[PDB]
Amino acid sequence: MNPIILIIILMTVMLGTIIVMISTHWLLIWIGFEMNMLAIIPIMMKKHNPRATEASTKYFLTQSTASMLLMMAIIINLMFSGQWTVMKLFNPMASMLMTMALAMKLGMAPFHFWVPEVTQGIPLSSGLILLTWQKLAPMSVLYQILPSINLDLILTLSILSITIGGWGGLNQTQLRKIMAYSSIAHMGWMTAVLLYNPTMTLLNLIIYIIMTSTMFTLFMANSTTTTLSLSHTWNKAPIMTILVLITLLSMGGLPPLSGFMPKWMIIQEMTKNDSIILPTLMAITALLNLYFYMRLTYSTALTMFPSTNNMKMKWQFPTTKRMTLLPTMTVLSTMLLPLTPILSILE
Amino acid sequence: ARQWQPDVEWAEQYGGAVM
Amino acid sequence: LQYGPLAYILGEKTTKKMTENSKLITVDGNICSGKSKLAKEVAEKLGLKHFPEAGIHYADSTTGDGKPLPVRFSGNCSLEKFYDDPKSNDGNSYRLQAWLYASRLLQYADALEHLLSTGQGVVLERSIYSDFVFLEAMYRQGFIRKQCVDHYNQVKKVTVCEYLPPHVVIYVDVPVSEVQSRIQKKGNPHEMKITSAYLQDIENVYKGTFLPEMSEKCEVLQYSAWEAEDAEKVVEDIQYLKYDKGPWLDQDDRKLHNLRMLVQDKLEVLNYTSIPVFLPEVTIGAHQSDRVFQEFTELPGRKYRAGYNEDVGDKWIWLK
Amino acid sequence: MLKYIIPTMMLMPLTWLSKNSMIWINTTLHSLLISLTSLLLLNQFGDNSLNFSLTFFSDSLSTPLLILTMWLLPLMLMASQHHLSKENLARKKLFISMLILLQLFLIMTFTATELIFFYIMFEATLVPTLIIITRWGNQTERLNAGLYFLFYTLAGSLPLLVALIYIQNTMGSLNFLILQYWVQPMPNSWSNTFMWLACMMAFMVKMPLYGLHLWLPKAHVEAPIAGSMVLAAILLKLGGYGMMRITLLLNPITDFMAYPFIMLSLWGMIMTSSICLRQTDLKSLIAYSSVSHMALVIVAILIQTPWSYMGATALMIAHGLTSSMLFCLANSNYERVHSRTMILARGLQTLLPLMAAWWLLASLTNLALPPSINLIGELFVVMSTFSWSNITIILMGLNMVITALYSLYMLITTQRGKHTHHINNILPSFTRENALMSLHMLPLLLLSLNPKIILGPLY
Amino acid sequence: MMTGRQARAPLQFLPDEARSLPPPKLTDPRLAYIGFLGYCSGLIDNAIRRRPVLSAGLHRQFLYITSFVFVGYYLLKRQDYMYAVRDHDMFSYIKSHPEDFPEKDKKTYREVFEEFHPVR
Amino acid sequence: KFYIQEPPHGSPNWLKVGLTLGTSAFLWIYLIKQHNEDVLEYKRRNGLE
Amino acid sequence: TLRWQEDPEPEDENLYEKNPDSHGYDKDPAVDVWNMRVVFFFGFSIVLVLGSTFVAYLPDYRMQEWARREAERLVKYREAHGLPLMESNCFDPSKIQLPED
Amino acid sequence: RDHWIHVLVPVGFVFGYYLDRKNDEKLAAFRNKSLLYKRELKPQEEVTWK
Amino acid sequence: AKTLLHQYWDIPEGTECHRKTYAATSIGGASGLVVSAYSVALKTPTSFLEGVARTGRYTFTAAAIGAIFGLTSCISAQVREKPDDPLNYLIGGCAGGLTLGARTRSYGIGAAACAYMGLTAALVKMGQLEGWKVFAEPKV
Numbered sequence A: 001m002n003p004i005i006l007i008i009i010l011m012t013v014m015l016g017t018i019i020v021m022i023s024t025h026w027l028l029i030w031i032g033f034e035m036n037m038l039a040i041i042p043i044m045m046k047k048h049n050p051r052a053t054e055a056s057t058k059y060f061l062t063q064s065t066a067s068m069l070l071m072m073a074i075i076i077n078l079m080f081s082g083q084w085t086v087m088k089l090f091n092p093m094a095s096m097l098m099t100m101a102l103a104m105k106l107g108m109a110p111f112h113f114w115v116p117e118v119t120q121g122i123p124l125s126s127g128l129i130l131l132t133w134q135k136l137a138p139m140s141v142l143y144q145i146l147p148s149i150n151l152d153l154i155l156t157l158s159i160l161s162i163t164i165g166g167w168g169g170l171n172q173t174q175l176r177k178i179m180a181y182s183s184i185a186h187m188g189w190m191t192a193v194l195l196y197n198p199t200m201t202l203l204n205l206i207i208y209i210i211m212t213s214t215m216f217t218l219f220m221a222n223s224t225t226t227t228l229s230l231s232h233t234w235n236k237a238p239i240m241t242i243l244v245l246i247t248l249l250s251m252g253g254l255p256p257l258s259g260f261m262p263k264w265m266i267i268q269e270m271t272k273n274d275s276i277i278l279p280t281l282m283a284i285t286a287l288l289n290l291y292f293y294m295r296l297t298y299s300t301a302l303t304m305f306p307s308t309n310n311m312k313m314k315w316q317f318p319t320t321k322r323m324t325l326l327p328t329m330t331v332l333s334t335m336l337l338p339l340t341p342i343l344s345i346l347e
Numbered sequence B: 001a002r003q004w005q006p007d008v009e010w011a012e013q014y015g016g017a018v019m
Numbered sequence C: 001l002q003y004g005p006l007a008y009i010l011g012e013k014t015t016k017k018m019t020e021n022s023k024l025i026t027v028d029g030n031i032c033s034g035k036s037k038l039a040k041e042v043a044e045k046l047g048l049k050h051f052p053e054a055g056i057h058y059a060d061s062t063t064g065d066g067k068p069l070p071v072r073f074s075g076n077c078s079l080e081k082f083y084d085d086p087k088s089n090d091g092n093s094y095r096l097q098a099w100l101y102a103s104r105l106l107q108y109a110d111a112l113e114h115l116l117s118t119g120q121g122v123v124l125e126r127s128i129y130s131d132f133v134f135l136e137a138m139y140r141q142g143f144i145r146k147q148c149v150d151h152y153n154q155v156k157k158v159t160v161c162e163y164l165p166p167h168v169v170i171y172v173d174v175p176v177s178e179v180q181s182r183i184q185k186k187g188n189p190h191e192m193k194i195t196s197a198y199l200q201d202i203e204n205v206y207k208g209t210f211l212p213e214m215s216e217k218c219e220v221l222q223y224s225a226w227e228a229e230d231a232e233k234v235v236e237d238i239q240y241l242k243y244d245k246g247p248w249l250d251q252d253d254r255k256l257h258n259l260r261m262l263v264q265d266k267l268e269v270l271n272y273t274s275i276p277v278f279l280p281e282v283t284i285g286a287h288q289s290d291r292v293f294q295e296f297t298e299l300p301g302r303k304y305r306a307g308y309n310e311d312v313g314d315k316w317i318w319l320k
Numbered sequence D: 001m002l003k004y005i006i007p008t009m010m011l012m013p014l015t016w017l018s019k020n021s022m023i024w025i026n027t028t029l030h031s032l033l034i035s036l037t038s039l040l041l042l043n044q045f046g047d048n049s050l051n052f053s054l055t056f057f058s059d060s061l062s063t064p065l066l067i068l069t070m071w072l073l074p075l076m077l078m079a080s081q082h083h084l085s086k087e088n089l090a091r092k093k094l095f096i097s098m099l100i101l102l103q104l105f106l107i108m109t110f111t112a113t114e115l116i117f118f119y120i121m122f123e124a125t126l127v128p129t130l131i132i133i134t135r136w137g138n139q140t141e142r143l144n145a146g147l148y149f150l151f152y153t154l155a156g157s158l159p160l161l162v163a164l165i166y167i168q169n170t171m172g173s174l175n176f177l178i179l180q181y182w183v184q185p186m187p188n189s190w191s192n193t194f195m196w197l198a199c200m201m202a203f204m205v206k207m208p209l210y211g212l213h214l215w216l217p218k219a220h221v222e223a224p225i226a227g228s229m230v231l232a233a234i235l236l237k238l239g240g241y242g243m244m245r246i247t248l249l250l251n252p253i254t255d256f257m258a259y260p261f262i263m264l265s266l267w268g269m270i271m272t273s274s275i276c277l278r279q280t281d282l283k284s285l286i287a288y289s290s291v292s293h294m295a296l297v298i299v300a301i302l303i304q305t306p307w308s309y310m311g312a313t314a315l316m317i318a319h320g321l322t323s324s325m326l327f328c329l330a331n332s333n334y335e336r337v338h339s340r341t342m343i344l345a346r347g348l349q350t351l352l353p354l355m356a357a358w359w360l361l362a363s364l365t366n367l368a369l370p371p372s373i374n375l376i377g378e379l380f381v382v383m384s385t386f387s388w389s390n391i392t393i394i395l396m397g398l399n400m401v402i403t404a405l406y407s408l409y410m411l412i413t414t415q416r417g418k419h420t421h422h423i424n425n426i427l428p429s430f431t432r433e434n435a436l437m438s439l440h441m442l443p444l445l446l447l448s449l450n451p452k453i454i455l456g457p458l459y
Numbered sequence E: 001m002m003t004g005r006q007a008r009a010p011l012q013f014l015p016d017e018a019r020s021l022p023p024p025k026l027t028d029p030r031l032a033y034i035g036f037l038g039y040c041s042g043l044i045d046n047a048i049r050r051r052p053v054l055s056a057g058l059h060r061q062f063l064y065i066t067s068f069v070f071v072g073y074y075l076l077k078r079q080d081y082m083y084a085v086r087d088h089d090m091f092s093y094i095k096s097h098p099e100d101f102p103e104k105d106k107k108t109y110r111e112v113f114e115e116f117h118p119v120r
Numbered sequence F: 001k002f003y004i005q006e007p008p009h010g011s012p013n014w015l016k017v018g019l020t021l022g023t024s025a026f027l028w029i030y031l032i033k034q035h036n037e038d039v040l041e042y043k044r045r046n047g048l049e
Numbered sequence G: 001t002l003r004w005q006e007d008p009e010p011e012d013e014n015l016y017e018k019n020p021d022s023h024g025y026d027k028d029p030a031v032d033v034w035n036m037r038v039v040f041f042f043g044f045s046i047v048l049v050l051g052s053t054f055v056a057y058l059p060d061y062r063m064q065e066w067a068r069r070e071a072e073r074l075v076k077y078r079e080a081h082g083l084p085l086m087e088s089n090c091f092d093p094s095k096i097q098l099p100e101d
Numbered sequence H: 001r002d003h004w005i006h007v008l009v010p011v012g013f014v015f016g017y018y019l020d021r022k023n024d025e026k027l028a029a030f031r032n033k034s035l036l037y038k039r040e041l042k043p044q045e046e047v048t049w050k
Numbered sequence I: 001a002k003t004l005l006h007q008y009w010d011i012p013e014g015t016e017c018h019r020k021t022y023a024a025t026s027i028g029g030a031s032g033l034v035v036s037a038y039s040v041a042l043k044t045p046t047s048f049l050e051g052v053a054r055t056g057r058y059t060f061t062a063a064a065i066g067a068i069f070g071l072t073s074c075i076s077a078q079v080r081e082k083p084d085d086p087l088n089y090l091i092g093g094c095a096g097g098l099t100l101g102a103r104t105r106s107y108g109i110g111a112a113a114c115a116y117m118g119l120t121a122a123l124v125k126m127g128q129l130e131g132w133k134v135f136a137e138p139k140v
Ligand SMILES: CCCCCCCCCCCCCCCCCC(=O)OC[C@H](COP(=O)([O-])OCC[N+](C)(C)C)OC(=O)CCCCCCCCCCCCCCCCC
Pocket: A274, A275, A276, A277, A280, A284, D152, D155, D156, D159, D162, D163, D166, D191, D192, D194, D195, D197, D198, D201, D205, I123, I130, I131, I132
């Protein structure tokens, strides 16, 4: 792949996301969505093996179905309102269709079946781009239309996403599938707290983006895609084992790490509206995400798995990868709890 | 007498396609 | 980094420095085939850089001060013990073969990096494409098990698939009887332990498995013992070849840029050599690996990165 | 409380900038200096607490626990430096760093005026102990012990977070000084029943309650010696401090919602003492004894009378010191014979006489020999439970008989009888082990002269 | 929540009303903690690249601390402004609607009655 | 010389060192100036002068 | 077959072998004797002794002695004037409004 | 100094005490205003406590 | 599914056993039909007969659980003369769990289902009595 063509395609992805974010017209939202998806397809097919083409095919089919549903909701809203301003919708059918289209684009359960296969079939950098950047635009569109969202539908999608993500991630050994199920659970949390205070949703989105970026950056720094290849890291670079230990502890929401702050503020917001059963259920379910995170930390940092002979040949050479912003997001994802009142900048 | 560290069987259990 | 996408954007095209003398030449043969001095005389005729044959301590020569490390830090294996006792209980034979394959892969990456960055041809001795011959001979002699062959095939399948074959492969035909006469004339006390069956198996897997599969993807020149001494005939044959086979023809700037990006990252080169496949020969325990790694870190010039070692005489660390 | 927090975090550059051989000396010296400094918290008044700031305060309940923590840290540094002898230097500094961090979280936990800050520190204490257990433990099942411990604590404590946030939204503040004056009766309903369960189950798990105690004979056993000391001596008392602080909001619903746990903990101590009678492992026997004593503290807190509260805090401090000493003695035996079986190494009084004297003193304080503070706490709890009901004297007398039985069974099995013939590596006792034993014993015996400083905020 | 407030003047980090507020001190404890975060990130950057942690590249660690202090100062300014706006809107709405916020008839404890539950 | 190959970080990149120190000094003086005018405008608007 | 490559269990080191005067603190005799001196001085001579002296002379811990003195004063004052020493009601019934029933 | 590592911690204690005193001065809103300890100021002083 | 729950909760407890049992059976059959639809969608059967047999089995099991729970809770409310009491719903939930154990033909899963679904039914009864909200409307 040419460096210049790669640059143009990446700026086209960001341009599509910007076009979705800044526009006041529904047709422009649709245009930005298709521009983003069309530009991001070649990032998935960088390596040209059958798994990448299979993942690209499944991603294309899912995004095209969601896009057609979104256009249907927009046309129904135009029919029943005569305008295109991106604001609250004037039909329950249009609201339901748009909510399910955005759920399909985000990959929340029960539309979650494409996320782990697509994440597994593509490289680590493209998977990072997908699971981090692709979710900024549907959450912005959801942030713009909350007066029309059905509460029962979005809460059902949230609790289903959390439970299905935890139960799915319990069984995986590949790192990309673990990251995908973790993503599903976190989007469940984010859209759970959406209708009460969307600022908490923005804070959770930012924290999840930073933590996922740190974990994926460590993964490509060590070039590990499985559990055992990650377990070999103690005999190559133990500082990376310490970093993945603290980041995986923070991903589980354990205090006093920075991953405790989103669910803490979400539980704080949900109890103000006299909803007590759902935050307890979501915490008890997030214990499963903590379980497979702790299993990863057992295999990687807190024990010494047997290594092989050629690790000496790997000892004799230093790393030269451009681990971009890795110390910054490593610090920002673990020691940010004393700066919790900084969330007022997002309102 | 020393600390126990995982054997080949531990990692071989951890290294399947599914857990 | 010294080379990256920014340099390739700014006009660094590898086809500009690629002349007609930039060829990759691999010399093969039996144990004492005399291919060494033939490779030397070829390399000093077309003015190509000679890479001597990679041993256990090749990576020690590439890094650090270039002096050979102790055997417990590099290799953890002995060639002399393989010659004395090929059927040893500790699995020295396959451990040595795997380490030598990794060293040959590192040497191939270094050769390709030099070729793509300087545009100068490189003469090699027994590259990675002619390394499985010794593994097949060791398996046919019963020295190693089937699992060792399966592990080697997995590592080779995931490593050799992203490299380009040599331009010219030169093979030197010396019979096993003359090979045995040469090794008794040499005087090495452990090299006289080599049986005739091992050399016969090496010759059989050179002739019947290596040359038929390499004549399709590259060009093979084959010589006898006495006509290999005339290096002028060999350099005439190399200068009069018609290069029309192999994947070297359909190489544009983008493909060679990706290849050069691959071969200059040595940790990305050796990523798949230590795959988590637990064989009794190559799996090292946790305590032993920890002890050896802590011993290796305390070596002079090895504790930190290359430019940041105070005890070996580096300055301006606080500004670096 | 910043005059104790700042030297504790300054211990971290002290252990990360010391020499390769001077880390233990420096850390032990400066931790002992801060432990001496911790006596300035004894400026307590008969009416008002010692309120430092908006975030920190320390009444007469949290002060003995603070002094115990800050005194316990150099003991763990002295204990844990023999089995970490051959360890890498960076791993040694990481171990000392986890101990320092745990002490910092513990001294920020007991002084937290806000309840949610207490919760945050009380669950920040989970990570260093889990890392210590699962990394420097010696056995295979240290990973399973860490999983059990972590998940019992978190499953107990997430409803506590939900209930504390509900109390914050309903009352308007979680400040403990405000809630003493703004408290309201909690009527009888199902909502308040689940409020009581949510506010109580975290500290019932952490104490532990009988039936929720399954994580204790694992985490107390597969841990290293310093981990076992900090788990038995301090970490079980976070539950006691939490129930002492949180019972203020749960009235008058406690008087009938406390019945099932009173029956669980009155019958539970008999079961755990009987388990102690038939234990093949010394460390497990000490852990089950800890379960029984914490069941006593649970009953004392639940009946909520002044005598019960004084007995509960005195018993907490006394059991912390005694359990730490017993774990240290068992660790010394483990270093000598490399096995935790109680029947293996016998008759050690003929070989180790002064260690046998230390064993006898620890056993005597375990069975509450008067006038030790063990007996003072146990006696006050017995008096208050007799005031509660009269058949509690039958239960307490049975518990005392079995407690004396298993303590003397420990002593007679390990120290008395004929020595093992084939064991010949019984080295003489080092000065370090004897100094550790005496530093556990002498404060415990000295506190009987002035027992008024460990009797809680309503002495 | 406050989009109607931040809707007439969009995409402004700090509106002109923020300059009436006291700026954070340069000895702010939050700013010092953010500088410590920057120092920790510099040390991690030294550590992952196998450099001497406390000695290599003092210019890099100084730029880390400086960048963290700069960004943290501006974020703290915005945070203080937004809490000020929250309080201002709250008090204006309380004052504008006196019917919905009546004065509570406070009574001394000699008139109120509380049930007594004995602990025996 | 100790090494067989000259390391890429064998000598400090003086251009990068100068850029780092200049950027840090520029950021510090810009922050100080911004804080000074901020407190001046606060005292001007509030009349605390 | 033969299993993976691993060092055997090392023999336990006797600290009394190379150093019969060991206190068990460190393998170097100087570090060991200095650790013993540090622990014995700063633990027993400093913390225990001066801590016991500090606790012994605490300035009227929790106002018990003041309470005894004030109780003596109040008992003398109430006994001199024929007053009852203590009443059944802590607060005055005059300043208490009972609920009407 | 060759023993600065032995003066890291006591200066930490001194700095913590100084910060405690500073915060105590910061919390002086009810100095000489409490109903139990309200009294007239003796001359040659300005505050009851610091 | 909204009208089924209202028509179940419109009947006073301990009053009409047949109508309460019918409403509970309809709710159970609907849930079993949803489960069977997802089962035959994701895990495709070998033939039409296997799929319709799985559908009938799941629907019948869920409907039997619902009928047994409704009948047992209504009967216990009738006998004890305590209509507003979660103990009746606990008894009905344990009866439903024992029916689930009878259908699957194993004692242990039946006992575990008795305990867990009796606790769940009791919690639903407490929520109906105290007005707990599960999908709470936004308020602040
Ligand atoms: C270690 C294992 C055991 C752990 C046990 C943990 C405690 C057990 C009970 C926890 C209940 C859940 C938290 C309740 C918090 C209540 C706060 C409150 O305001 O209550 C009043 C509120 C009342 O609602 P409200 O306050 O919104 O309404 C205003 C008040 N009224 C009703 C008068 C209008 O209660 C509730 O909202 C519901 C409380 C009951 C919740 C039942 C569901 C959970 C069941 C137990 C789960 C236990 C853990 C399971 C998993 C274990 C591990 C796998």
